[model samples]
Target chain A: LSNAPLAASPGQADKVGAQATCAAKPIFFGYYRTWRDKAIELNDGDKWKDKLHTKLTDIPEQVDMVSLFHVPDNQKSDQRFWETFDKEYHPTLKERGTKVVRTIGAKLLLNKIKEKGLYGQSREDDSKYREIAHEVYEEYVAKHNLDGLDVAMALREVEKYTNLRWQLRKIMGAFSELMGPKAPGNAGKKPGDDGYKYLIYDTFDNAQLAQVALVADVVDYVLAQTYDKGTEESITRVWNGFRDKINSCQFLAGYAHPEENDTNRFLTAIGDVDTSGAMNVAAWKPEGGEKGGTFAYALDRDGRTYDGDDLTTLKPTDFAFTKRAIELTKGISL
Target chain B: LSNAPLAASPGQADKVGAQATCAAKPIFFGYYRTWRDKAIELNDGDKWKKLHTKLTDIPEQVDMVSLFHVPDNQKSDQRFWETFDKEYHPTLKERGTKVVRTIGAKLLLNKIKEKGLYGQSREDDSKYREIAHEVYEEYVAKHNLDGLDVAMALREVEKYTNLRWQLRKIMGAFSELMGPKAPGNAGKKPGDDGYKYLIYDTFDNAQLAQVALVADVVDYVLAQTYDKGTEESITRVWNGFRDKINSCQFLAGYAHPEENDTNRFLTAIGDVDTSGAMNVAAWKPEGGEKGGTFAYALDRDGRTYDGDDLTTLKPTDFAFTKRAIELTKGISLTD
Candidate 1:
């Protein structure tokens, strides 16, 4: 067994296979929303209003990776978004030392698969949808030079008990396989192969994902989304819960929008929870920026706000608060 | 007003007496209990356990060293009780560090209660002044020490009849003895006074509030926020007293070798807010493991100071304390 080659010869470089180095400190993942219609007029008369394009640059240096909040469910729209991103933002993002990943909601895409009658159908029949999903994902990876994908949805309780669990694992595994040991014909030849590959899952609780433990090997890391529950207990419980099932190294505590406003929550998550403990991940969403229409596309025409967290309403000035959050979490500022 | 010469010509040396240099960072103050009954029997016939003799082993990085719990019995019998005699004073002074002695609360309270002057104002009984005079002339001047620190009163004694007034007089007496450079000690350096400070140490906020009223009389208020496990409590105290004292201090009460408590203290020290002038009371060099020895007696395997022997330190005792010292570089240690 030791003498045998692991697999056949390599394929063309999968540019997305560029390894995202593991952080000695907790990883800082920021979710960047790509689908917003806000723009700013640059001094050069070039309109800078494409929210994702302009604000992706604002992703702080401290962030380990900036995940596009999602690729659109519609194939055409998804292709367009990634294509634009590839041309405008991908290079800058890579230069900033931040890895990139695509996020897809479990329920959103799974329901679509069910609508396509792919669930519980024969493996051959089901794989047709998986085939299409994989094809679409690979095309984007090849075309836009993406790092990898993130299954953002939490598996529902019923999905855990049903055949959907197996289907979910198969789909997740398929994505991992497509990303790696590049397929025979695809050997070493993905368009933007800097040799980095990642498959992340974002969930409020890993214990809830029954099938996830099976595919832990395929997933690089799981963002245990604390969301509004940013307590030391929540962070610890999620990290501990998943650590037993998967590689303990693959856990990252996820904090979301409004919860960042709670100073106590921030302190507990950043200060109380031992950083040297099992969990070594810390990620946030809608990366901070001033609004005249910026990072979190939650604001409106007048620069008035509509999201959660009053701190965000102040726009980019509130960038300090988020910067402080990063400092408290990782002991360094962006 | 600027040309009034601030003081008469006789005070030229005093005026030239530059203010003590403020530390670039918040002072890392540790209390060493010199009078203890532990002896480290060495390979040579010499025995070594007294904190004063072992005091030289303390890290040079430390800003101030407070001699712990000098009781009243020693002060009343000053001539014979030479606990903090000329012998140790020169070594402490040579280290270029402020050396303060802990004035135990039991003694202060008992002496005041026994003199029938616990609640009497300076107006009600001039005996309070006499007592302060003796404490200054005998205990402070006799020892050639830098300052005196009240370990703390258990309750809010300021609320008692004239206790607040009597407390003020005592604090005022110490401030005057500390010389004119002391805040609010303008014209009263009457009897052998030079660079002496008064520190009020307590763990209670209400008690702190009472002491805070005489903030001008004290140089630093050391809050005994023991237990390194909870940092928010310490931060709250630090933020709370920012407006009230020249320096707000936090004490780390560690019972080391019980590893858990020591780890907790280190963790808490890591989380302390160092944005202002603050004091951290941590560790003594010579005490045994159970006494919360921050620096080791010998650089043994299980416990070490930044991987150096007890006699020599490599910039720090632990990762957390080193990190804490770096965090407070923005603040000045002096008043």
Candidate 2:
């Protein structure tokens, strides 16, 4: 996907230019919110509806998809201040604020993953999550009047039992997020040192792989969060592993990188040919800002400068990613 | 001030050594549903409650005290987790889980501080936290009870206005936690870093100190947390700081250490002793289980291990904190 907006803001012909070509595909979008008020936050007061209308009207061939991220704001203690609420107010609110925060936060995260095809559903953690998912799905369907919203059965998360199937029958898709427990021979280790290795390794835990593969039989994907690294390297590594489930499994490379830059690692992972050809790319650019200044900050001299107007734009690396994107999809229209 | 128990478990006197001259205080105690539910989690349910009762029953002569790490669990995803809750499940059964976990965890922390006479409140991202001391006091009066509870205030994180108050309000005094923006003076060159010097030298911040020092005024004694390097170093630094505060500002220091230790730098900018005693103090008999493996682990490398059936308990550390409890009037005293 190009940083270019698929649609032109009426009358801004100068900004529209020749690059405003892919304004017709089913483009994905997202908005931000905090866990305190996640549901209303997602609706964004009807902005998404307007964006969807704009995308479809301008580019008839494209559909619109969106995801969300509910992050905490460090500044405002006006509403959800931890202290006042705890010692003074929350007791009066008379609710279990802490549990609600964790549970709802997990739910929103799960929703975002499902939207991006990176979330997996499991039977553990009180499979009640599935029943909850089902109720939500039915409600959404009734409200939006949309058809064919089939919840897929794609499992990932190292372990799988038939009990998950029973839970899956009640929800939408059957999937799980699994990156093995860092390594073998250390079954009960914490998520440090060894655990990290097993999670990143391909065959670190064969038993887990096999078990998950069994569940993958009926599901469509196993979402292993390959993140905290460059997008290209992360994507390449996740794709290479589980080659056996190649066609069946889909990967979700966490793209939480604050900056919009291309790097050597990402280039190398995407491959030289793809890098040169401008293939298989994905990006979400804001409508009003310059390509380089849209993101929060930019990376320079291997460091970040918060003041450099939208340094996160990383304009220098765009073509590298574009070429890679071209090679991966073999010139297929995004 | 004593490690003595107010009451012994049924008939374990012989096991505890019938000749032992130590007080036999209950292992756990609390009041009402809120406090009771909490003690249960730490496995000293009845004992913790019994101690509370013993102290409360004779408030005129005894001062009950205790502490706990509120929110005992500090997960990295706190921001995102709380954010999500604000949106989706604001009214769920577990709605206030995060807030309560944080406050309840402070039970032991406050008790320890109450003995020191410090209420260091700081402005943080959690705005409400800035006034937690007043809030907690009101809570105490409304509840018609006061003895021991959680750490009053300390800046947990410099980021949030609320989360940061738990520790800030204790050490830096309420004023120091409110670090002053540097004056626009051209005298200092690049990277002069004079904030530390100003804070250390200017007793002008004493007004802010007064707010936290009020901890001493209202509560019997105030405990100010001063964690240095090793436990031993911390003891030394704490003792010295207490001496200075006593001479200069009539403040007392009731030092308390974290159970599962972690080195979290203080957020408030104030008169913290750079001597770093606590920073270097050794954890006398540092390792080995508590009560379970009362087996001592000394500072020495080879002889660190001590078995449960050791001939004599190591009186060097652990069992006795560097501090001997000092109660002046309203301060903690489980008589």
Candidate 3:
């Protein structure tokens, strides 16, 4: 490959910058907590502070991939959360290389894998599930307007037993065969390409190294669920396990923040009070490579502060930890 | 660091060979199976038969030898052990060889757990120090072996809650207590001194990445590559642990015939190479400074030639082991 210089005239640098050889920055992936409060017109003026409630629009601009932590079921009170996201956030987020995805746990994904009979019920019945697999992929990932799919499998059957090994392999194989980088999948289309969707696996335990290696080539990246254990040593230990199977570019850790605006609202990860924890994880790069950045779990509680008669008492800021994490760890060499 | 000359004479050539200007040769580490059977008299001679095999019969070319299959009752091999320590070890040690012993991690952890010494969390590592004590005393000191090879089988049981911490604790202890130079314990303690190697062999399981963390702590890391034979397959296992292991401290492994297809035995040379055994013996790590190559259960190397069925069992005179050390240290003969 020759390094020929491009002669840009006047307003042409932006087009040249788009095709630069350098990579895009590491993502600022966040999990959004919807169903907090209903949306209203801005003429009502700041319902978050006046009525002391958070809405869908409070998510800051730093988030690159916003996962819908819980999608509501069209109830009247929760109807505006989705409507506000579709109209206000999705279009703007997509333009900035930011988009929303749905988080489905193992219970939902397993039922489809068990849709056909189990693997040893007959070997002949295995690949037949791919038909059902692609149909389900189109329903959630391809046909839907959502940016991608996030499946969290914390407890893996391959860790202990053999019954679900082939089942899990096939379930993951369905996505990989169609959309992964390796294997013959639509002439090597991967995440963020035309007609291809981004995928992420939120893994909790990786004692099953082979299975972790299997997921390494298939998914866009892996989000390690090290929410409580966020020290550099702890995160590096988790990253070391991925050495044979993955690069550090595809590894990220998770953290939790303190609770805020708790007059009525509380979802999960509410009691964590480590004020410096987010930046502790954010500044941590691996020994010889750059870390793939960290994410805050259940980010609706992000605005809390502990300045009071008791240091445990809560106050408000505008996503202080989330913004600070980006300030310290965000990469923009390109 | 300097470019010095040999300043040699014709008569001093072999003496200078003893003290080469470069660092030591790459090792030929092998594992010898003990307690195979009782020794028989050579009168009518089943000599070189399986029952009458001798430790001294091992080739002097081998640089490191591990005593495998130790007895449940240590005294059961006592008489043979005495003769071995007398003639075999001392003779080989003078030839710049090391005689080490093996201890499987699964058995040791099982022993620790049975004594109610194992913990369920990180905070309960109080009994962890005792397990390291027993491994050193019973295996290394009592046997008076030159080095130690801890063979860990990667299983879920090994990492069940507190056991993972126990592994790191024990391995970390071994690291600080022993090394290639025993530098961690150098002049710090009154422990055994000189040539005390701490090697790790990951076998009986697949998830070796955990062992890769402890790779830096040991003198050498041997991959369980005997199930595979070709250079491509062996090097993949070598490259997997590259995150922590240095190329100088990593060794690839293989069994005698590689058991999968015995037709892998004595096959025709492929455009220059002979058997699968010869092929792997010639293979080294991609980036040099490799620790070396090791093989076990290869005492079965030279035997009968029942070859009318078109599969030839070529006669042997330590052909595999000689080629092992040669390729390990010298230039290619073909080159």
Candidate 4:
């Protein structure tokens, strides 16, 4: 379990009580804004309501719509990023009439930090960092009553020397279960696991729990990403690791997502992690190398260059087509 | 191999010339008679040249061309039954065609015969003399040029029985083989069997020496069909049964009309029986149950009333639709 926590909710209800406070849980809800021409051109949004009304009607009555922000590592201009964000997220929030925002993806943070370092044309100097760098994270959290963070790390993990495509489907399934049908970007608290606040890297299986001992009491939520790896190893280790705490438990998010839908089949292969009461954040990876500020300076298959798109766009091909593949093959000079 | 000769084909240049002269050297020819329009609708007489052309191209070049006849057995008065033969067969014979007709499909034959004997019918007697017909036939064959009788019997056997459909694709594939780009049916023959006859029955997998038994003795061929049952079991048994026969033999005729090229998907599934020597004939069944009728008289799926404009005109329903089912449950009973 990660040390995540539930951040926001309209209301709570007693599950077994006669009169429940939270009534009428819509099973499913489309997170898209109004169906516009440009939106159609972008083709990123789901039109499930229009085309498959028969299949979609009340299908997600118990489903909650979650917001996601998978932006580039660093925006060329914060103003442009903010402008794009408001245009995309604001309309969705206003139209759907849900207050799901500030669930910043890891891509945005990684990108911004990387970009600042790149522009300076110097490696991150520990000496300089200790002297000038203040607690930027603290200030950022305060600015947004910050529900939680989604720590999507697939792009980062794949980028790391591991040839990891087969693991995608397994992880995607787990994350989908972990993230339930919550409104995107609703960084909820993970399950109870530790005594202190800390970000948790999800465990694919219980065998990997021993690794969690290193970060037992560090960040806010020890959000672990379990994929091809099983839940028993890490799940029990976290359970047993902090078994002494008694009261303070770990936060765990299970992943789940359908193989295909009319619009797209991304969920079929990618894992979704929904943490209850755990500080949740969707994982993200920038397109470009670390030489640039953020991973956002990546290239999309469409030939258009972009700093980064939504982290929620975790399509399988996005992971498969990597320049890093060039490095893996020997005797090839790129 | 079950007393059947192996599949037959032209001898390789390497083999001594002796085996080449055995039986009628199995030579097969093919032609696509109906490029389009309705072939089954033509009277057999009208369809003869096309049937002849479809049966054997270069009439003297080959021993046989399996004919393919398609007409909805559902209707008794369909053009193929009343007209095609009326207009076709004789003209082809006059043109010096040596091919034999083997299409008496259960459906068409049944309907034709049903029309031939409707309302009040007189029974033609002398049943005892007719019983000794085959023995008398043997004596007659030995004494004269009975080749014409053999040809008519072959044609009649093909008309009303299961062989009607089995012959079409034989004709189609045979037409394509020597005439164009088709493999002679004997191409898949198994080794170890000296017998070579490509006998084909509709829809089976067993490679019966059945065809070999027949093919070994004659350059020409004959096929026997006993495929009667539901779809699933029929397909399995038929496929398995055909697999046993030697591929070298040319097929005479066997089974249902649709199993050959009487219908299309039916042919695609059945083209596995490809060999030059083999040809097929699907039966055309009319009313009055014959010992071997291909199509069944299904009154339940009736398209014609007793006294309608096209009286006794029948049409088929779903392939698996059963007459027993129609009778027991009754259409109006409404499931």
Candidates' DockQ values? 0.00, 0.01, 0.01, 0.00
lDDT of 2: 0.25
Location of the lowest summed lDDT over 10 successive residues in candidate 4 chain B: B284-293
Interface RMSD of each: 26.6, 31.1, 41.1, 29.7
Best by TM-score: 3
Q: Which candidate is the best by lDDT?
A: 3
RMSD of every candidate to native, in Å, equals 27.6, 25.7, 26.7, 27.4
- Per-candidate TM vs. native? 0.36, 0.26, 0.44, 0.23
Candidates ranked by TM-score, best first? 3, 1, 2, 4
Candidate 1 lDDT score at position B144: 70
Model 3 chain A worst lDDT run, 10 consecutive residues: A11-20
TM-score of chain A of 1: 0.63
lDDT of each: 0.44, 0.25, 0.56, 0.25
lDDT of 1: 0.44
Query: Model 1, A1-334: lDDT tens per residue?
Result: 1121122112111121112332234445667655432222222211122222235556556555667665343122444445556665677777867778777777765675666666542243535555655665765455467777777756565344556665565566566566533333335443234555766676656555534464555555656655434445655565556554554445555544322112211222222223412122233221221100001111111122222223212233223333444555555644
**Chain B TM-scores of the candidates:** 0.58, 0.25, 0.73, 0.28
- Residue by residue across A171-290, what tens digits does model 3's lDDT show? 565556554453364465545554446667777735253355546656666787766565678767776666555666666776655443221222122234334655567767777676
lDDT tens digits, residues A93-146, model 2?
Answer: 223111011102223424543454332334233334434544544443323222
True contacts kept of each: 0.00, 0.00, 0.00, 0.00
Model 2 chain B weakest lDDT span, ten residues long: B288-297
Tell me how far the alpha carbon of residue B14 in candidate 3 is from the true structure, in angstroms, after superposition: 37
Q: Candidates ranked by lDDT, best first?
A: 3, 1, 4, 2
Off by over 4 Å in 1: A1-26, A36-54, A71-84, A121-130, A155-160, A180-193, A209-211, A259-314, A321-334, B1-335
